[PDB]
Paper text:
Microbial epoxide hydrolases, cis-epoxysuccinate hydrolases (CESHs), have been utilized for commercial production of enantiomerically pure L(+)- and D(−)-tartaric acids for decades. All these three CESH[L]s exhibit high sequence identity (>60%) with L-2-haloacid dehalogenases, which are members of the haloacid dehalogenase (HAD)-like superfamily. Studies have shown that both RhCESH[L] and KlCESH[L] adopt a two-step catalytic reaction mechanism by 18O-labeling studies.
After crystal screening and optimization, crystal structures of RhCESH[L] and KlCESH[L] were successfully resolved at 1.94 Å and 2.02 Å, respectively. Two molecules are present in a crystal asymmetric unit, and gel filtration experiments showed that both enzymes form homodimers in solution. In RhCESH[L], the key residues involved in hydrophilic interactions include R124, R145, Q150, and D152, while L128, F137, V141, L159, and L176 participate in hydrophobic interactions. However, sulfate ions, from the crystallizing solutions, were observed in the catalytic pockets of RhCESH[L] after the co-crystallization with CES. The residues involved in sulfate ion binding, including D18N, Q20, T133, N134, K164, and Y192 from the core domain, as well as R55 and R59 from the cap domain, formed a polar substrate binding pocket that was well-suited for binding small, highly hydrophilic molecules. Activity assays revealed a decrease in RhCESH[L] activity with increasing sulfate ion concentration, indicating that sulfate ions can compete for the binding site during catalysis.
Residue numbers in the entry:
A (entry chain A), B (entry chain B): 11 to 247
């Protein structure tokens, strides 16, 4: 049925929240309290989402590193009374988004899938960032794809379709894999299969994630290994 | 000194000649003699080269799969007194260029290199072709880059510079690895380092060799593992 599996990375395969909390607290130390920082991280992601949403609607693309950097700068102003940072520290903090760690099932799951399928990333993050995340999150791919290559972010159709063209396959031959429903709904619009991965801790132990019922998407799993098992991929030794 | 290595793939890492000889004989069987099929493969590589040379001069890009397919159709007409092939066999033979096997040093050389460097493919072949060749040749990349992403073949500057900016890396921090002098001299012009890999059997025992003496390029080696050793990579037991 499918020839390739295309993956969202931030959240779906990576624990961004934990990564940035600890990264930040290591750059900043006692200048900041964990609870303020965690709240900042939560707002930083929100800012990212809002800016991308605006950009998508305006049919524009910009460096995601810049999006992240500029949102941190704005947030630092909001929180100026509590702590401060240098421009050099801004660059270091922003780097955390390129040092994402993976959820425990990811490396092995992805490897299991490769017995039967090509695996590729389709990310909104810039090409350089995904290459970097490969090392921090231990992801091995057949291909790496980014919005930067198409000049458009997901959910735009061009992304998914462009990936297909690049991979020499029809969109119907792609299974999109994501823990964000908007991504899967846009993939289904171009004919792809959809696989939702539940990440209950994506937004922290007290966070609220999307509740997805059985039947909305083709697959509904709690780990990439589980998805590989449901697609009939043999197990690793 | 370097953050990443960018590699030519066909010939540099892959024994395309042996691949397409055994692949064609596997498909055509006894309908063609081995020595005739070998001469066809050499002319087929020659047609690809002349065609790309022509397109580079015209600032044009076209699918490399269609380049191999059309030139094979032409060669079949010239050899049509001797053997024949169906339209389905044309497509199966052309697939040979997406099933390239690697030289024996290559899979473990690439692995040793990854301990200190990012490694990426920069190929004239279509994106899907290099993705398929990763399975047949056993190549694992941090990134795969193709002339198809840039609309231009190597040696155009825009391919190396495009690779550099997508990776977010200064060209002076990229080492280009190739067994073809034209490729390394082109990379040198954009500021990259150069590593020449001698492949005495690329065009078979009686082939057109360009001799490179020492000092023409930054590195001159006989295997990717030797290159890894010269870059100070630990050997992996």
């Amino acid at each position: 049925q499918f020839r390739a599996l295309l993956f969202d990375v931030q959240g779906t395969l990576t624990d961004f929240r934990s990564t940035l909390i600890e990264h930040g607290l290591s750059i900043l130390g006692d200048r900041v309290d964990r609870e303020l920082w965690e709240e900042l991280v939560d707002q930083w992601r929100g800012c990212y989402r809002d800016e991308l949403d605006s950009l998508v609607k305006q049919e524009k693309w910009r460096s995601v590193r810049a999006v992240y950097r500029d949102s941190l700068i704005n947030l630092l102003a909001k929180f100026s009374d509590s702590f401060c940072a240098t421009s050099a520290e801004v660059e270091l903090l922003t780097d955390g988004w390129e040092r994402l760690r993976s959820w425990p099932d990811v490396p092995s799951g992805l490897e299991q899938l490769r017995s039967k399928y090509l695996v590729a990333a389709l990310t909104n993050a810039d090409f350089s960032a995904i290459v970097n995340v490969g090392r921090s999150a231990k992801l091995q791919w057949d291909a790496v794809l980014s919005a930067q290559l198409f000049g458009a972010y997901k959910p735009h159709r061009s992304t998914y379709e462009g990936a297909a063209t690049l991979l020499g396959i029809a969109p119907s031959e792609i299974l999109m894999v994501a823990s964000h429903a908007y991504d899967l709904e846009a993939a289904r619009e171009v004919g792809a299969g959809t696989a939702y991965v539940r990440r209950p801790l994506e937004y922290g132990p007290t966070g609220r994630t999307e509740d997805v019922p059985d039947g909305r998407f083709d697959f509904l799993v709690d780990s990439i290994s589980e998805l590989a098992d449901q697609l009939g991929c043999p197990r690793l030794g």
